[PDB]
Design a protein around this ligand. Structure first.
Ligand code: HEM
Length: 207
């Protein structure tokens, strides 16, 4: 089924994502809140773009029940960044890394083409990933760097009580999606590309 096929086809990329030099250093306590803050800045840029694409696709009527607006991160991230940076100064300073420009450009293409199958792939990669190991990341930013849980709002999905049931139900929605063979292959290819973008984001953050 689709949920299982997405996991297996991106398993080796997810393992490569655990081990990027930036994320590895970040999670082991080698960097700092500054570096976490740079990550979240780039994440605000690509979550903002992804969420426009999600809005487009949901409005078209494709995968509507999967595209839960409580998942939206961009506003919560902006609130986290206001706290991390001390003010709203950041919205006029931050610029997209080249990795992020590529990623945003693909999400904007998916938005404008209202490409349901591609959007779902990216939604899976971003949102199921954040729901799944996000707690791990938040815990380490508190443990290693003393970040206030109030500035880790991205990792709380306010509005979700029972997370484990939410994740199981998300995978059921994936499995229940009406897809032709070309739509399924396009989705799976896209999910692989999503991990490729994310790996280059971390590479640029590392540079
Ligand atoms: C490129 C950055 C990352 C992305 C895009 C990502 C994405 C994902 C996705 C999509 C899943 C769900 C897989 C599935 O169940 O089908 C997942 C699960 C998981 N993630 Fe990540 N992840 C990333 C980084 C990390 C990091 C740095 C860790 C820390 C070790 C981590 C820990 C986990 C764990 C433990 C799971 C549990 C497996 C599962 O629920 O299937 N992830 N991630």
């Amino acid at each position: 089924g689709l949920a299982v096929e997405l996991k297996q086809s991106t398993a080796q990329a997810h393992e490569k994502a655990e081990h990027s030099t930036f994320m590895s250093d970040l999670l082991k306590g080698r960097l700092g809140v500054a570096e976490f803050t740079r990550l979240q800045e780039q994440a605000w840029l690509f979550y903002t773009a992804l969420e426009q694409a999600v809005d487009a696709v949901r409005a078209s009527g494709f995968a509507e029940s999967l595209l839960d607006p409580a998942l939206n991160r961009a506003e919560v991230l902006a609130r986290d960044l206001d706290k991390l940076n001390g003010s709203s100064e950041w919205r006029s300073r931050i610029t997209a890394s080249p990795a992020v420009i590529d990623y945003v450009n693909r999400l904007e293409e998916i938005r404008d083409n209202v490409d349901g199958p591609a959007l779902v792939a990216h939604h899976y990669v971003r949102y199921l990933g954040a729901l799944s190991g996000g707690q791990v990341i938040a815990r380490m930013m508190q443990r290693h760097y003393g970040v206030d849980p109030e500035a880790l709002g991205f990792y709380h999905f306010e509005g979700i009580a029972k997370l484990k049931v939410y994740k199981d139900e998300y995978r059921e929605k994936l499995n229940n999606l009406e897809l032709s063979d070309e739509q399924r292959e396009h989705l799976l290819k896209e999910a692989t590309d999503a991990f490729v973008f994310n790996h280059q984001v971390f590479a640029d953050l590392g540079k």
